């Protein structure tokens with residue numbers, strides 16, 4: 001079309017603008033074809049404490065430091081998502097009609113959707129062996145994550161499984177931008193007031209996405225349906241994650257939950 005392609009572009013531009021780590025900037029680091037200075041590999045406890053030597057500032061004033069090895073990892077890992085939530089909250093502005101929604105419906109969308117988008121985008125920085133960290137400056141291996149003591153070794157491995165099959169779709173930021181937009185405009189979230197209004201808004205994004213996918217990836221005929229399954233998959237992935245988070249709350253007495261994330265997880269699933 002033309003007006004649609006403008007909207008699809010308006011979304012993409014908001015994607016690159018807000019999220020500092022896109023799939024292009026990431027796949028080039030993992031390829032190592034643009035530089036000979038690879039990110040610092042974190043594969044065991046020694047390499048971890050080395051890299052942590054860089055953040056000794058944020059670690060001392062936060063009281064972690066002497067905390068357990070796993071707690072330290074996923075303590076800063078929370079600060080990441082808190083940032084991605086903010087970037088996502090701003091990315092939602094560009095969505096046509098979103099800013100107009102009732103302030104309650106806006107928060108509800110961003111409540112049940114953020115983590116579904118975080119894990120989706122989180123695939124862009126993963127591979128079969130690990131993921132990028134610190135805006136591409138670090139690469140934490142996948143086996144080291146599976147080596148932590150339970151239940152921390154069950155946190156990231158599920159996401160790696162999704163990112164491997166999801167990456168297999170060969171998507172570019174051009175598409176993910178729209179894909180993440182549709183995730184936020186899901187009219188299925190509990191507590192939505194104007195269900196009719198939101199569904200109209202989502203159908204616009206999905207319609208744009210369905211044509212964009214057929215245009216940018218014409219050979220993968222059922223690519224659009226596959227992604228719909230992925231949305232369903234992510235919805236399930238975030239649910240299990242929420243259960244595993246609350247499981248860490250009812251047992252681990254030395255792992256505190258970030259204030260912002262508390263409100264998100266509160267009575268989520």
Ligand SMILES: CC(C)(Oc1ccc(C(=O)c2ccc(Cl)cc2)cc1)C(=O)O
Pocket residue numbers: 074075077078081082155245246248249255256257258261
């Ligand atoms: C992906 C990530 C960081 O996943 C978590 C993994 C571990 C924790 C915790 O260590 C923790 C701390 C306090 C409580 Cl009450 C429960 C769990 C939190 C989130 C997220 O969700 O952004």
Ligand SMILES: *c1ccc([N+](=O)[O-])cc1C(=O)Nc1ccccc1
Pocket residue numbers: 051052053054055072073075076077080133134135
């Ligand atoms: C998260 C957990 C642990 C560390 N660390 O001790 O090396 C770092 C991070 C992290 O995400 N650091 C970061 C984020 C963004 C930009 C630069 C560095």
Ligand SMILES: *c1ccc([N+](=O)[O-])cc1C(=O)Nc1ccccc1
Pocket residue numbers: 042051073076077078080081122125132133134135138140
């Ligand atoms: C945790 C959640 C999300 C990201 N991310 O996609 O930027 C990274 C991490 C993480 O584990 N960061 C990290 C960096 C350095 C040392 C430990 C942990």
Ligand SMILES: *c1ccc([N+](=O)[O-])cc1C(=O)Nc1ccccc1
Pocket residue numbers: 055058059060062064075076077078079080256257258259
């Ligand atoms: C955010 C970024 C980096 C670190 N760190 O490596 O010390 C910590 C945090 C952070 O906000 N931790 C936290 C968890 C729970 C409640 C408040 C703060």
